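Complex record, two chains
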Amino acid sequence: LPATHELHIFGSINGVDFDMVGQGTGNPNEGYEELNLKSTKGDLQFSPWILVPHVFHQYLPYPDGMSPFQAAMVDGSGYQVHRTMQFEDGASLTVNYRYTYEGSHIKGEAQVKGTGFPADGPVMTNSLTAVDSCWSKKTYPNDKTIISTFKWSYTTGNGERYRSTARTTYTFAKPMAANYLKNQPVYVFRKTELKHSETELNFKEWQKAFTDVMGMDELY
Amino acid sequence: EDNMASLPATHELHIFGSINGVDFDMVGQGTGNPNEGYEELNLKSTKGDLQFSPWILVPHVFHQYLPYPDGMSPFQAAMVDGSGYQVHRTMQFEDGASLTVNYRYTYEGSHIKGEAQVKGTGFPADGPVMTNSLTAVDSCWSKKTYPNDKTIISTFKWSYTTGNGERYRSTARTTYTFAKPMAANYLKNQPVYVFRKTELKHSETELNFKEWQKAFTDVMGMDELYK
């Protein structure tokens, strides 16, 4: 179970290179995590909001014990993550995650590639103001894979929603225990907070999983 | 087990009052699914164009539609018994504005008639409420406690989005007064967390409202997550 983490998040938005590193803590019994990120290449020339929710499900417990994300970390086996975001304006963003566990400390490597953002849109003009809390639906297509789907929205400087759909594929090196497979789908609620400058992000995230729940399809 | 399939599934609302002395009055018919926590409502002004943000009437525009994980909510139990409950909600805004809503219900058979008396005061004259420049609301959790056998107190943090993409924040407290004491399975099982999503399509004289709600019991780390 983890207490501390660090993130190296890097890549390009519309070919604009960015690199950010920082340290964080959390409570893996309550699904809380905190992160400070600093630009290693000066002022971000795009909305810092575009890095949310991408800026550690090792912090997410399940109702009656560890999440499969936690079980895989404790075992040492671990998991890789591929997220694809498809935006209402035709823009696309991909994030690849690689983790190492230097003790009870998680080291995150997040490779991001974003293309097709309109030059005068709110992402490239840094005019996004907020994000909404979000439900995700987690299914186990096989005993090695978790696919998470959610609908994501940013608020723009004009008070409109800037919408995207997301699919996250979790690939475990080692199968998930049998007693995870009997409980699907799994619905997770997440709230995030971001305080930011041009070079620094202060991120918080609260998350909670719900298992044998009826009438959650339209609601999520 | 409770006869959930038989619960009333039609309602009407008469919502009226004033916002900074701007009088309004709307009447409309709705339907829903009390087994799945879904309700729909159409409202039409009886006094022409609303001269403030229709968003200010959300979430105020029927917890008779809300089931509990193992049966009737107390709201539905009180309706089925016939004793019923009354509602008082206070919204306190970041700019010092305040809004109160008093609800009274009567059950004309399977049909719920709600009367919602609204008084909003203290809104800045050139703010987004009085100038009709609010654009949206967020989905919201509420926490319900039972301070005594005839009372439910619900608290939540509410936010509107403004024309500038900022949050216009309020804190809310809703007190439910039951004419008859609530059953044992309610009082021993607290607090209750309710997640709600709303949809609003509106003109200056007509609102089309939708709400989805789901109650959760015996949940652990909800203290900060629900806010």
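Note: The longest strand of chain B covers residues 22-33.
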